[PDB]
Amino acid sequence: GARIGEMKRVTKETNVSVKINLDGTGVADNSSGIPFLDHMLDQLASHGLFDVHVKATGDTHIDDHHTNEDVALAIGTALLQALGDRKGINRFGNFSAPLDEALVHVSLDLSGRPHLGYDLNIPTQRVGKYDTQLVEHFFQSLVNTSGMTLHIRQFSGTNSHHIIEATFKAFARALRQATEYDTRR
Amino acid sequence: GARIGEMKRVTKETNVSVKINLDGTGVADNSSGIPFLDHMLDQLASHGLFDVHVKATGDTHIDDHHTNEDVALAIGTALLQALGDRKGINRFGNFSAPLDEALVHVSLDLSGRPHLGYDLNIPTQRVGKYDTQLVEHFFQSLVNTSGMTLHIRQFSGTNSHHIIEATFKAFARALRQATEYDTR
Amino acid sequence: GARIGEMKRVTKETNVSVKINLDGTGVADNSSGIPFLDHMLDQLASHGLFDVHVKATGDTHIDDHHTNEDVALAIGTALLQALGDRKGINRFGNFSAPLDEALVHVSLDLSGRPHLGYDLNIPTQRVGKYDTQLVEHFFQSLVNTSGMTLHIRQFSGTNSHHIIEATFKAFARALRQATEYDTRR
Amino acid sequence: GARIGEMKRVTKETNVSVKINLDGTGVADNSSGIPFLDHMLDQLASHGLFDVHVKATGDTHIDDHHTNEDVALAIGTALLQALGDRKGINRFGNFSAPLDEALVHVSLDLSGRPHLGYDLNIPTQRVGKYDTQLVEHFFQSLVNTSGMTLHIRQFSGTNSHHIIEATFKAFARALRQATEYDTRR
Amino acid sequence: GARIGEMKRVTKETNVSVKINLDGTGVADNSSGIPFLDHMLDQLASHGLFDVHVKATGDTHIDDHHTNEDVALAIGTALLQALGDRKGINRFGNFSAPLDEALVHVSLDLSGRPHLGYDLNIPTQRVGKYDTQLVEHFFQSLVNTSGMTLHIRQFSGTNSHHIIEATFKAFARALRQATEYDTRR
Amino acid sequence: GARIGEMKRVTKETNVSVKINLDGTGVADNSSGIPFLDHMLDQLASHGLFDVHVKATGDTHIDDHHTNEDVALAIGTALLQALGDRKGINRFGNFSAPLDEALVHVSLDLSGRPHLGYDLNIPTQRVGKYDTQLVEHFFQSLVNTSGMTLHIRQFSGTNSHHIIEATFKAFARALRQATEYDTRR
Ligand SMILES: [Cl-]
Ligand SMILES: [Cl-]
Ligand SMILES: [Cl-]
Ligand SMILES: [Mn+2]
Ligand SMILES: [Mn+2]
Ligand SMILES: [Mn+2]
Ligand SMILES: [Mn+2]
Ligand SMILES: [Mn+2]
Ligand SMILES: [Mn+2]
Ligand SMILES: [Mn+2]
Ligand SMILES: [Mn+2]
Ligand SMILES: [Mn+2]
Ligand SMILES: [Mn+2]
Ligand SMILES: [Mn+2]
Ligand SMILES: [Mn+2]
Ligand code: NA
Ligand code: NA
Ligand code: NA
Ligand code: NA
Ligand code: NA
C-alpha cells in the first residue's frame, strides 16, 4: 500500500527519471549528473525516510540549470502522483533544522496551490561546481509541479554548504510530517 | 468522557450560546451573526478537530464589536470549563500555518495566566463586512476568559483574508496540540 | 476549428462555470457574482476578441475572495485546455494600455511555468464593493492553473478603476497576441 | 476610400491649413513657419506613412508659440475628422523609438478623452531657433482637439534634437498602428 | 530570394565562420566553442526564425573573450551584408521578453549608426563556464559591425541564466521585426 | 433670452439627461443616481444661481464611476452649448469659498482650451457611499467637454464633506461670475 510516484521525461536538453516512495525507509539512489544536488537529494531519503531514485543526464556542458530544473519539475510531479487523493494526511509540515551555525525553518502545506516564499542568504556563488542560484530554482520548480505552499526561512548561517544542506534537511523532515497520516483522521 | 464546555450569556447587547468539544471530530456549527467570523470559527473545527457550536445574535446594527467580543469571551469560558483540571495534557501548543504567501506562527500555553502577544500586520480595514480591528479583540477576549498565554506572530503575508485565516489555522492546530494528552 | 476550453467546478464555497474561445469575436458573457470583476472580464472579450463566458455564484456573504479565486483558477484551466499543444502560436504577448492618466504594461509568455510579477499601486481599498486586494489574487490564481509567465507593471495612474481596467485591457491584448497563430511558422 | 481630414483656420495671429490622409503613403509637405517643427512633422509622414500637409504663417516675430499651438490644434482637429466613427480600427498604438542614445516610448488610445502624460527631459532650451518648451505644448494642443489619450516617456537621451525626433518617430508609429484597421474585426 | 549574409575570418586568435538567413525558418547551427553562447545563439533561430550558422574555434585556453568578440563582430558583418540596401523593411524592432522572473526589453533600429545602450544587472560572474562580462561585449561588437542602434533594458530578473536568455529572446524577436518587410511600403 | 444648454446621451453604461440655464434663479432638480453628487449639483444651483436639471441612471452596481463621468461630460457639453459665441461675458471667474475649516479657491477661464489644475487633499476614501476619487474625475470630465481652464486649490480643510462642498460652492460662484455679462462690454 506504499504511495509511489514516478515520472520520466525526455527533452532535447535533459533525460530525467524519478521515483519516490512516500512510505519508504530512506533508500537513496540519486544520479542527477549534478554531484552536489545528489548529496542534497540523499538528505530527502535519510531525513525524510523517503525512497528517492533520480537518474538524469542533460546538457551540463552549458551549465547545470536545465538539468536542475527538469529534475525538480519531475520530483514535484512524482510527489503529486504519489499523494493521490491526499485523504487523511497531516498535509502541513514544519521543521527547523540546525547544521552547525546554520538554522533554516521550512513550513509547507500540501495545498494544491503553488507558492514559494524563499529567504536564504547564500554568501558564495559556487559550492563545488554547483551554482548556488540553482537552490531557489530547484524549490520553485518543485513547488510549481507539486502544487505545494512552501516557506523557507534562514535564521542563521555563514557556510553555503551548511545553509543549503540545512534547508534540505528541514524540507525533508517537514515533507515527511506533511505526508504522514493524521491518526485522528 | 469527552471534554465538553458550554457557555450561554444574554446581555442587553448580545445573546450568545457556545459549546466546544475538545475531543471532537471537526463538527462546525457556527452562526455568530458575523459571516467572516463564522468562516474563521469553522477553521477551529476543521483544523483543530474541535466540535464548535456558536449561536449568537446581537446589536450588529451598531457594528460587529459587541457580538465579536461576547462570542470570544464565551468561547474562552467554554474552553476553560472543558479543560477541567488539565491533568495529563500537553498544555503547550505550537504551529506555523502557511496560507499561500501568508505565514503565521502561534505559540500558546494553557497556563491559567492570560496574556496575548499579537503581531499581525493586516493591511486593509475590511474583509467583506468584517472590521479587521476585531481580530485582535477576538483573541484578547478569548485569552482573558480562558486564562491562556497566546503568542501570534506574522512572518509573511499581504492578503488580509489570508493572514487572518492562517492565524486561525495555526491557533486551531496549536490548541489541538495543547489539549491533547501527553502519552508519557 | 476554434480553440475552446471549458471548466465547471462546484465546491462547498463556489459554483463556477467557464468557457473561453481563443478564436472568438468578442462575445462577453460574464456573471461572476462580482460586478466589478464582470466589468474587467468584459475587457477580455472586447479587447482580446475572446469569447468569454463566466457564470459563478458563491459565498459572497463572507466576502468576494473565494469566488474571485475560484473564477480565476477556472479561467486559467480553461485557457490551458483551449491552448492544446500550443503548436504554431506567437506564445509571447506584450501590450501597454493607457486609460486616461493610467498606463499599465503587460508582458506574458505561454510557457507552461507559472510566475506572476505584479507591480500595481492601487491607491484605494474598494472600487465599488470590490476589494482591490483581489486583483493580485485573480492574476496569481489564473497564472497558477494556466502555467503562464505574467508581468504586470504600472507606469502611471491615480484612479483605482482606471488602473485596474487598464491592466485588464493590456492583459487582454497581450493574451490575444500570444494565442494568435504565427503566420511564418 | 482614404480617410482624409482637413482644417483651415485664420486668426489675428496665425493662418493655418492642414490636411492629413490616414491611409497615405508617406507624403511629407510641411511648411509651418517653424523649420524644426517641419522636420518633426516630416517624421509623421516618413514613419507613420501618413500624408501630412501643413502650411502655416504667423506672428513668429513675437515667438513661435502661437504658430506652434495653432498648428497643433489644427492637426488634432484634422485627425479627429479623418477618423470618422473610428469603426474597426486598432484604436491603441504603442512604440519605442530609439535615435542613437535617445529612447522614447509612446502609448496612445484614440479614446475621445483628451489626456497628455508627458515625461521628457530635454536638456537645452533651443534646438536651432526652436524653443523646446513648445514640444509639450504641441502634443498638449494636439491631444486637446483630437480627443486622444497620449503618454510620452523618455527612457534614455542626452541630445535634445535626438530626444524630440525620437518622440515624433515613436508618436508616428504608434499613431499609424492605432489608425490602421484591425483585420480580425 | 532569401537575404543571406556570410563571413569567414581567420586570425591568430580565432577561426570564425558565420552564415545568417534573414528569411529563414529557425535553423539553429551554432558551435562557437562557447557552449552557453551557443545556447544563446540558438534563441536567434528559435525566436527570430533566422537561420543561424556559427562555427568558431579559438584561444579559449586563455579565456572566451577573443572568441566571443570575433563571433559577435562576424555576426554583425553578416547581418549588414544580408540587409543589403534595407529597402522596404520595418527597420525598427521592439520586444519585451519574460523568462520566469526575468523581463528584458530590447529596442533597436537598423540605422547604420552603431550605438549600444545596455542596462542589465547580472548578479553572478559565471553561468557555467561563461564569463557574464562577455554579454555586454557580444552586443557591443555586434552593434559595431552591423551599424545597429540597440537598447537593452532589464526590468526584472534574479537568475543570471534567465536574464541573459530573456535578453537574447527579446533581441531575436526585435531583430525579426526590424528585418521583416513592411507590407504597406 | 436665457442661455440654456441641454444634452442627452444614452450608452450601454448610462442614460444621462442634463439641462442648464446660465441665467437661472437657482432651481435645482438633480437625480444622478449618486446622492452625494446630487447634493453637490444642488450647490451649483443655490450658489451659482444656475437652473440645474440632471436625470441619470447607470451601472451603479459596478461603482459610481461611469455615471459620475458621463454626468460630468454631459454638463460640460451643455455648458458649452449654453455659452454660444461667448460674446460680452466676463469669461474669467474667481472665488474663495470657506466652509467651516475648509477653504478652497477656484480660478477659471472660459477659454476653449481644456485644463484642470487640481490640488485637493481629501483625507477619507468615502463620503457616504461616494468614492472621493470621483471628485477629480468629475471636474476633469467637465473641463474636457466644456473647454474650460479650471484651477482648484485647497488652502485649508480636514473634513472631506466640507472640502468637497466648499469646492462646489467656489466653482459655482466662479462660474456664475465668468458667465455673467461684462457691463463695459
Ligand atoms: Cl496596490
Ligand atoms: Cl524638459
Ligand atoms: Cl551586470
Ligand atoms: Mn529556468
Ligand atoms: Mn554535506
Ligand atoms: Mn471591546
Ligand atoms: Mn477563506
Ligand atoms: Mn486565497
Ligand atoms: Mn470602466
Ligand atoms: Mn499657449
Ligand atoms: Mn534630425
Ligand atoms: Mn575585447
Ligand atoms: Mn536555458
Ligand atoms: Mn473614467
Ligand atoms: Mn452638506
Ligand atoms: Na525570495
Ligand atoms: Na455581465
Ligand atoms: Na518642409
Ligand atoms: Na549547438
Ligand atoms: Na493634481
After which residues is chain A discontinuous, taking C to N > 2.5 Å? none
* Cross-chain residue pair B100–A92, CB shorter than 8 Å: no
Interface list for chain E against chain C, based on CB atoms closer than 8 Å? 25-26, 49, 95-101, 103, 155-156, 169, 173
* Cross-chain residue pair E105–D96, CB shorter than 8 Å: yes
Cβ within 8 Å of residue A82, ≥6 positions away: A3, A4, A5, A20, A21, A22
Name beta bridge partners: D15.
D10, D57
Distance (Å, rounded) from C-alpha B152 to C-alpha E48?
54
Q: How far is C118 from chain D (nearest CA, A)?
A: 20
What is the number of other CB atoms lying within 10 angstroms of the CB of residue F158?
A: 12
C-alpha distances out from residue E72 to A40, C66, D137, E38, E126, Å: 39, 53, 44, 12, 19
Give the number of whichever ligand sits closest to the CA of residue B73. Answer: 6
Which of A65, A126, A136 shows the shortest C-beta gap to E161? A65
Give the number of whichever ligand sits closest to the CA of residue D65. Answer: 10
Q: Counting one residue from A and one from B, how many pairs have CB atoms under 8 Å apart?
A: 37
Instruction: Fill in the amino acid letter for B142.
Output: L
**Pairing relationship of beta strands E14-21 and E51-58 according to DSSP bridges:** antiparallel
* Cross-chain residue pair C160–F133, CB shorter than 8 Å: yes
| Residue with the three cell numbers 555586434 | E142
Please give the distance, rounded to the nearest whole angstrom, from the Cα atom of residue A149 to the centre of ligand 17.
34
Please give the distance, rounded to the nearest whole angstrom, from the Cα atom of residue E27 to the centre of ligand 19.
11
Residues of A in Cβ contact (< 8 Å) with B49: 184-185
DSSP character string of D59-75: -TTT-SHHHHHHHHHHH
Burial annotation D111-137 (CB, 10 A radius, 16+ → b, else e): bebbbbbbebebeeeebeebbbebbeb
Question: According to the 3-state scheme, what is the secondary structure of C32-66?
Answer: CCCHHHHHHHHHHHHHHCCEEEEEEEECCCCCCHH
Which of C59, C64, C133 shows the shortest C-beta gap to B159? C133
Q: At what angle do helices F133-146 and F160-179 cross, to 10 degrees?
A: 10
Instruction: Fill in the amino acid letter for F98.
Output: P
DSSP helix/strand/coil, A137: helix
Give the number of whichever ligand sits closest to the CA of residue F36. Answer: 15
Torsion angle of alpha carbons A78, A84, A90, A93, nearest 10°?
Answer: 20
The grid cell for D87 is 469603426
DSSP character string of E104-173: EEEEEE--SS-EEEEE-----SEETTEETHHHHHHHHHHHHHHT-EEEEEEEE---HHHHHHHHHHHHHH
Distance (Å, rounded) from C-alpha E61 to C-alpha E64?
8
DSSP C126: E
* Cross-chain residue pair F133–C161, CB shorter than 8 Å: yes
C-alpha distances out from residue F88 to F26, F49, F84, Å: 22, 19, 11
Please give the distance, rounded to the nearest whole angstrom, from the Cα atom of residue D170 to the centre of ligand 18.
20
CB C108 within 8 A of CB C141: no
Please tell me which residue of chain A has the smallest CA distance to C114. Answer: A144
Distance (Å, rounded) from C-alpha F59 to C-alpha F14?
6
Burial annotation B99-130 (CB, 10 A radius, 16+ → b, else e): bbbbbbbbbbbbbeebebeeebebebeebbeb
**Pairing relationship of beta strands C149-156 and C115-119 according to DSSP bridges:** parallel
Q: Which of E53, E59, E63, E61 is nearest to E8 (CA)?
A: E53
C-alpha distances out from residue F89 to C101, E9, F183, Å: 33, 80, 9
Residues of F in Cβ contact (< 8 Å) with C129: 63
Residue F66, H or E segment: helix F65-83
**Pairing relationship of beta strands B130-131 and E51-58 according to DSSP bridges:** unpaired
| Residue with the three cell numbers 493662418 | D15
Please give the distance, rounded to the nearest whole angstrom, from the Cα atom of residue E162 to the centre of ligand 4.
6
Name beta bridge partners: B14.
B58
Instruction: Fill in the amino acid letter for C157.
Output: G
Residue D92, H or E segment: strand D92-99
Distance (Å, rounded) from C-alpha C20 to C-alpha E142?
44
Phi, psi of A102 (to 5 degrees): -85, 145
Q: Counting one residue from D and one from E, how many pairs have CB atoms under 8 Å apart?
A: 40
Interface list for chain A against chain B, based on CB atoms closer than 8 Å? 92, 94, 105, 107-109, 111, 113, 115, 117, 149-151, 153, 184-185
Torsion angle of alpha carbons E136, E139, E142, E147, nearest 10°?
Answer: -110
Please give the distance, rounded to the nearest whole angstrom, from the Cα atom of residue E125 to the centre of ligand 9.
48
After which residues is chain E discontinuous, taking C to N > 2.5 Å? none
Mutate to test the interface with C, among B32, B101, B159, B165 (most CBs of C within 10 A): B159
The grid cell for E150 is 540597440
CB D125 within 8 A of CB D131: yes
| Residue with the three cell numbers 535578453 | E167
C-alpha distances out from residue D71 to D77, D129, E126, Å: 10, 17, 56
Q: How far is E36 from chain D (nearest CA, A)?
A: 29
Q: How far is F59 from chain C (nearest CA, A)?
A: 9
CB C131 within 8 A of CB C60: no
Residue E19, H or E segment: strand E14-21
Cβ within 8 Å of residue F155, ≥6 positions away: F96, F103, F104, F105
* Cross-chain residue pair E98–C184, CB shorter than 8 Å: no
DSSP D54: E
Q: How far is F21 from chain C (nearest CA, A)?
A: 30
Please give the distance, rounded to the nearest whole angstrom, from the Cα atom of residue D69 to the centre of ligand 10.
6
Name beta bridge partners: C15.
C10, C57
* Cross-chain residue pair F114–D114, CB shorter than 8 Å: yes
Instruction: Fill in the amino acid letter for A124.
Output: T
Q: At what angle do helices A65-83 and A133-146 cross, to 10 degrees?
A: 30
The grid cell for C64 is 468576494
Distance (Å, rounded) from C-alpha D179 to C-alpha D174?
9
* Cross-chain residue pair F133–C39, CB shorter than 8 Å: no
Phi, psi of B61 (to 5 degrees): -70, -20
Which of C26, C101, C103 shows the shortest C-beta gap to D107? C103
Interface list for chain D against chain C, based on CB atoms closer than 8 Å? 92, 94, 105, 107-109, 111, 113, 115, 117, 149-151, 153, 184-185
Q: At what angle do helices E65-83 and E133-146 cross, to 10 degrees?
A: 30
The grid cell for D11 is 486668426
Residues of E in Cβ contact (< 8 Å) with A61: 35, 128
The grid cell for F57 is 441612471
Using only C-alpha atoms, what is the Rg of chain D? 15
| Residue with the three cell numbers 552557453 | E36
Q: How far is C84 from chain F (nearest CA, A)?
A: 35
The beta strand positions in chain F, using DSSP E, are 4-10, 14-21, 28-31, 51-58, 92-99, 102-109, 115-119, 126-127, 130-131, 149-156
CB F83 within 8 A of CB F75: no
CB B148 within 8 A of CB B109: yes
The grid cell for A108 is 509547507
Tell me which residues have their CB within 5 A of the ion that is ligand 2: D 122
* Cross-chain residue pair D94–C99, CB shorter than 8 Å: no
**Pairing relationship of beta strands D102-109 and D92-99 according to DSSP bridges:** antiparallel
Establish whether chain D is in contact with chain E, requiring a minimum of 3 CB pairs below 8 angstroms: yes
From first CA to last CA, the distance across chain F in angstroms is 18
Residues of A in Cβ contact (< 8 Å) with B97: 92, 107, 109
After which residues is chain B discontinuous, taking C to N > 2.5 Å? none
DSSP helix/strand/coil, D32: coil
CB C68 within 8 A of CB C38: no
Subunits adjacent to chain B (3 or more Cβ pairs under 8 Å)? A, C
Name beta bridge partners: F131.
F126
Mutate to test the interface with F, among D144, D146, D149, D150 (most CBs of F within 10 A): D144
Give the number of whichever ligand sits closest to the CA of residue D119. Answer: 2
CB B89 within 8 A of CB B79: no
* Cross-chain residue pair A105–B96, CB shorter than 8 Å: yes
Interface list for chain C against chain E, based on CB atoms closer than 8 Å? 92, 94, 105, 107-109, 111, 113, 115, 117, 149-151, 153, 184-185
Q: At what angle do helices C160-179 and C133-146 cross, to 10 degrees?
A: 10
Cβ within 8 Å of residue B29, ≥6 positions away: B52, B53, B54, B55
From first CA to last CA, the distance across chain A in angstroms is 18
Distance (Å, rounded) from C-alpha F60 to C-alpha F68?
9
- As to burial, measured by CB atoms within 10 angstroms (0-12 exposed, 13-18 middle, 19+ buried), residue A126 is middle
**Pairing relationship of beta strands B149-156 and B115-119 according to DSSP bridges:** parallel
CB A94 within 8 A of CB A177: yes
| Residue with the three cell numbers 506574522 | B154
Helices within B30-159 (DSSP H only): 35-48, 65-83, 133-146
Cβ within 8 Å of residue D72, ≥6 positions away: D137, D138, D139, D140, D141, D142
Q: Which of C134, C116, C132 is nearest to C124 (CA)?
A: C132
CA D127, D132, D134, D138 dihedral sign is positive
Instruction: Fill in the amino acid letter for F6.
Output: E
Q: At what angle do helices A35-48 and A160-179 cross, to 10 degrees?
A: 40
Distance (Å, rounded) from C-alpha E149 to C-alpha F116?
39
CB C168 within 8 A of CB C120: no
Distance (Å, rounded) from C-alpha F48 to C-alpha B47?
63
- As to burial, measured by CB atoms within 10 angstroms (0-12 exposed, 13-18 middle, 19+ buried), residue D159 is middle
Distance (Å, rounded) from C-alpha B171 to C-alpha B50?
12
Distance (Å, rounded) from C-alpha B122 to C-alpha D16?
60
C-alpha distances out from residue B93 to A183, B108, B139, B170, E141, Å: 18, 5, 16, 10, 64
How large is the greatest C-alpha to C-alpha distance in chain E, in angstroms? Answer: 51
Q: Which of D75, D90, D62 is nearest to D32 (CA)?
A: D75
Residues of A in Cβ contact (< 8 Å) with E165: none
The grid cell for C34 is 462580482
| Residue with the three cell numbers 488602473 | C163
CB E105 within 8 A of CB E167: no
Distance (Å, rounded) from C-alpha C79 to C-alpha C68?
17
Distance (Å, rounded) from C-alpha F115 to C-alpha F149?
5
Q: How far is E108 from chain D (nearest CA, A)?
A: 6
Mutate to test the interface with E, among A63, A64, A122 (most CBs of E within 10 A): A63
Name beta bridge partners: E53.
E19, E29
C-alpha distances out from residue A135 to A34, A141, E102, E162, F25, Å: 12, 10, 17, 14, 76
Cβ within 8 Å of residue B22, ≥6 positions away: B2, B3, B4, B5, B50, B79, B82, B83, B179
